[PDB]
Amino acid sequence: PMFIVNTNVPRASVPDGFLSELTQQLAQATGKPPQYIAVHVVPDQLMAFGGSSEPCALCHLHSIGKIGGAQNRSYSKLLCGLLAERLRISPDRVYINYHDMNAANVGWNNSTFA
Amino acid sequence: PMFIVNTNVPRASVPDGFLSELTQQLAQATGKPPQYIAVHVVPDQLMAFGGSSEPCALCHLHSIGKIGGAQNRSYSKLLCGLLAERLRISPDRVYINYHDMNAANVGWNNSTFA
Amino acid sequence: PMFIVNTNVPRASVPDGFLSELTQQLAQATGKPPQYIAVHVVPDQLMAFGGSSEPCALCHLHSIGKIGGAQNRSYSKLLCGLLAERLRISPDRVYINYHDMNAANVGWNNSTFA
Ligand SMILES: [Zn+2]
Ligand SMILES: [Zn+2]
Ligand SMILES: [Zn+2]
């Protein structure tokens, strides 16, 4: 699984340990080993949500499987929780795009996961 | 809808008001309420288009519906127009990836749109 | 075709000429003319892969066609090889998401490729 958060929150407002917390929480949520989880945070972005530049986040989660209606609801509660608690972003100013990837469409280690 | 533009144009060349212009015109073109429109501009990028580092842009528009052949042509005319007039990027140096998202695959406000 | 690499490797570690090498080799791998290839490198990112922040990369390749199991394996070998040799990133710390785009879903030059 791989998760990106793009936000207008400043870099200094991202806590030490946030990447490790996302890794652990996503490992637990997806059930995948942490060794397979990648995370990426991009602060200081020029962005707006509903025309407003109050704190917001635009995110992506790519995973080979572990994507679906109930799972994505659970991930959204989890991830919005973390962004609210750690980055002080309101849940209603977060979007997360979920992409279920075929194994043949994810490259890694000189080949794909197929 | 969520629109991202990645460009090698420098930050100082992005005019004041541009996020607001994008929000307004995307709301009108997609028919979606402005509250649901998110926009993100990423200047100063290390990029090439056709092997050239002349001004260019690589973009993404995700939307739950309102994506299809005729709509996408319309969006491209609108967005390339804006990038040309505001950022001085030639339309033939812009790519826009359009993604029609299932409601169940978009997280927002602790849940999804499904 | 368009290729993005997000990495924690610093900007100064990206060698001169790398965008040009990526353009050339992607043109050859996809079979598409270099004039149609776009490349984007994003260094200095706040990322982790498998819980750690040694050099890693999260990438995307979007292409109208030229995507499939054998092609993607060949792209992955090529791209991991380049990231290892030029950016000193281990291949087992690289993910590449491959997206086959419909022509009507790629905007360019005020219209789409349809
Ligand atoms: Zn997406
Ligand atoms: Zn895409
Ligand atoms: Zn993707």
Q: How was this structure determined?
A: X-ray
User: Please, are residues A69 and B104 in contact by the beta-carbon 8 Å criterion?
Assistant: yes
**Contact status of A28 with chain C (Cβ, < 8 Å):** no
Distance CA B88, CA C65 (A): 30
SS3 A84: helix
| Residues of B in Cβ contact (< 8 Å) with A76 | 107-112
Task: State whether the Cα torsion C30-C79-A113-A72 is positive or negative.
Answer: negative
The phi, psi pair for A99, rounded to 5°, reads -130, 120
Task: State whether the Cα torsion C42-B2-A8-B10 is positive or negative.
Answer: positive
**Which fold, C2-112?**
Macrophage Migration Inhibitory Factor (3.30.429)
Which of A52, A42, A54, A48 has the alpha carbon at shortest distance from A7?
Answer: A42
Distance CA C93, CA C47 (A): 11
Q: Give me B32's structure tokens.
A: 């979606």
Cβ neighbours, 10 Å, residue B90: 15
Q: Give me B109's structure tokens.
A: 């406000």
Helices marked H in chain A? 18-30, 69-87
Distance CA B58, CA C36 (A): 12
Our CA-based measurement puts residue C27 at a distance from the nearest CA of chain A, in whole angstroms, of 18
Unique residue bearing structure tokens 């054998």: C70
Q: Give me A59's structure tokens.
A: 């995110």
Put the strands of the sheet holding A111-112 in their side by side order: A111-112, A106-108, C94-100, C57-63, C2-7, C38-42, B46-49
User: Please, are residues B94 and B81 in contact by the beta-carbon 8 Å criterion?
Assistant: no
User: Please, are residues C110 and C45 in contact by the beta-carbon 8 Å criterion?
Assistant: no
Distance CA C77, CA C82 (A): 9
Choose among C23, C43, C106: nearest Cβ to B48.
C23
In this complex, the chains that touch B, judged by 3 or more CB pairs closer than 8 A, are A, C
Which of B76, B77, B72 has the alpha carbon at shortest distance from B99?
Answer: B72
| Record: contact A101-C96, CB cut-off 8 A | no
Q: Quick one: resolution in A?
A: 1.3
Q: Is C91 a catalytic residue?
A: no
Distance CA A95, CA A74 (A): 14
Q: How far is the CA of A97 from the centre of ligand 3 (A)?
A: 9
List, as one string, the DSSP characters of A27-44: HHHH---GGG-EEEEE-S
Domain boundaries, chain B: 2-112
Spatial neighbors of B5 by CB under 8 A, at least 6 apart, are: B40, B41, B42, B57, B58, B59, B83
Distance CA A34, CA A25 (A): 9
Q: What is the largest CA-CA distance in chain A?
A: 42
**CA angle in degrees (0–180, nearest 5) for B55-B86-C17:** 10
**Contact status of C48 with chain A (Cβ, < 8 Å):** yes
**With DSSP H G I counted as helix, E B as strand and the rest as coil, what are the percentages for chain C, rounded to 5?**
40, 30, 30
Task: State whether the Cα torsion C5-C10-C15-C17 is positive or negative.
Answer: positive
**Contact status of A108 with chain C (Cβ, < 8 Å):** yes
**Which residues face B52 on adjacent strands?**
B49
SS3 B47: strand
